[PDB]
Amino acid sequence: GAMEKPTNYSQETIASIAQKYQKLAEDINKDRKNNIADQTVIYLLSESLSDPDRVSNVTVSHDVLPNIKAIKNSTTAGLMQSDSYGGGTANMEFQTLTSLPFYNFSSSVSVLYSEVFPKMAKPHTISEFYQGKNRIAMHPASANNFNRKTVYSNLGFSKFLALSGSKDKFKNIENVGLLTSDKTVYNNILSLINPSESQFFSVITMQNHIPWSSDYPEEIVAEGKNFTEEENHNLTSYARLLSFTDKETRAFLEKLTQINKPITVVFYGDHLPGLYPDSAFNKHIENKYLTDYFIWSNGTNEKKNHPLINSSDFTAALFEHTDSKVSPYYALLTEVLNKASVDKSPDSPEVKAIQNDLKNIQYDVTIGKGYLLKHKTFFKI
Ligand SMILES: O=P(O)(O)OC[C@@H](O)CO
Ligand SMILES: [Ca+2]
Ligand SMILES: [Mn+2]
């Protein structure tokens, strides 16, 4: 099966969970000031972006993420735990939108968009708080890769910019490396931002996707202990491409500050590039699955303490960072973010209890009975 049924799964257990977090949402909202629908949100999946400084046996001549590191110091930011290495982009993407963690599904599941999403009766995502005409997706490749076209059509999106497979195209396409530049993606985002509307962007870049090729900037060179010439060349090409994304990301956020609209960006690398051998990590193999993330608004920014979170925790962290009122569903996800996520012990009794609540909800909305359809406020603010 796609997911194990909790031992206590039943209509009454779902009822107990709905009521419990209905009241917790009320308490949380007594201190949440804003509404998520008042701000434009941008989920920016930065393909293969991860600071090589965390790879122990790697040496780079220059810091290739100086600007992004400065952004991380100014706002809520830290490390994201990835579920795969060198691939799995769409699986992280699914988790950001639904907030349903991959680690609760079965290992037999390969692509969540193909095996789980189609079986969900009414999938709830962050984009449902926005009007269909204001939901926008972007990816410089085939819209049908990993079944994205079907996902974003079923989610009521009005646009899906893609190099092929959809009516919506990118403008002024330029290549940095072999593939479409992040600059092109960023500028196409800006051209679509409508200050008169609250919008939701789901973006998946391609510039830093394998294969990596770049001869500039020449001064940036990188090597790893006992690497082959090919491995050193791929690392060098990747490090050079990161330096461009770093500068372009800074300029992108700068432009967002000049727009008269509250805008928040959830920026993250989906996984490390598949160019490092396991030896490169030495004493810290955990760094094989730790990418960079930040949650940045175009106005004033708090800095919540979340040094290590999952891709499924982003929405709950978004609501917290923007002090937005939550629904009973996101009240549960706020307890997971703070008390029962990947940074906590899986043997803690509190982590188990909160995870049991999540597993019952997660099972109910995927391949379960759908008891939550009768709890009509569980997903509403
Ligand atoms: O890194 P991967 O898993 O190949 O993702 C690529 C995908 O974004 C192409 O549409
Ligand atoms: Ca508050
Ligand atoms: Mn990827």
Q: Tell me, what DSSP letter sits at residue 245?
A: H
Both structure tokens of 269? 């690398």
**Resolution of the structure in the document, Å:** 2.0
| Token pair 């795969």: residue | 84
The CA 375 to ligand 1 mean position distance, Å, reads 36
Burial of 228 (0-12, 13-18, 19+ CB in 10 A): exposed
Write the DSSP symbol of residue 149: H
Question: Tokens at residue 39, please?
Answer: 């701000």
Mutate to test the pocket of ligand 1, among 92, 95, 145 (most ligand atoms within 8 A of CB): 145
Place of tokens 């949650």: 295
Distances from the Cα of 185 to the Cα of 145, 163, 180, 182, angstroms: 18, 11, 8, 5
* Burial environment of residue 262 by CB neighbours within 10 A (0 to 12, 13 to 18, 19 or more): middle
The method of structure determination was X-ray
> What is the number of the ligand 1 atom nearest to the C-alpha of 204?
8
Nearest to 200 by CA among 307, 127, 112: 127
Q: Ligand 1 — pocket residues by CB below 6 A?
A: 87-89, 139, 141, 145-146, 204, 209
DSSP state of 30: T
Domains of the chain: 11-374 (3.40.720.10)
Amino acid sitting at position 313: D
Contact 358, 330 (CB under 8 A): no
Residue nearest to atom 5 of ligand 1 (CA): 89
Tell me the three-class secondary structure of 47-108, residue by residue.
CCCCCHHHCCCEEECCCCCHHHHHHHHHCEEEEEECCCCCCCHHHHHHHHHHCCCHHHCCCC
Could you tell me the end-to-end alpha-carbon distance of the chain, in angstroms, rounded to an integer? 32
DSSP per position, 297-357: ESS-------SEEEGGGHHHHHHHHTTB---HHHHHHHHHHHHSSTTS-TT-HHHHHHHHH
Report which protein residue has its CA nearest ligand 1's atom 1: 87
Ligand 1 atom 10, closest CA? 145
Ligand 1 nearest-atom number relative to CA 45: 8
- Residue 9, sorted as left (phi over 0), alpha (psi -120 to 50) or beta, turns out to be beta
Q: Which of 94, 117, 3, 19 is nearest to 371 (CA)?
A: 19
Mutation probe of ligand 1 site: the residue of 89, 270, 291 with most atoms within 8 A of C-beta: 89
| Atom 6 in ligand 1: residue holding the nearest Cα | 89
Residue 276 sits at the vertex; the CA angle it makes with 81 and 208, to the nearest 5 degrees, is: 75
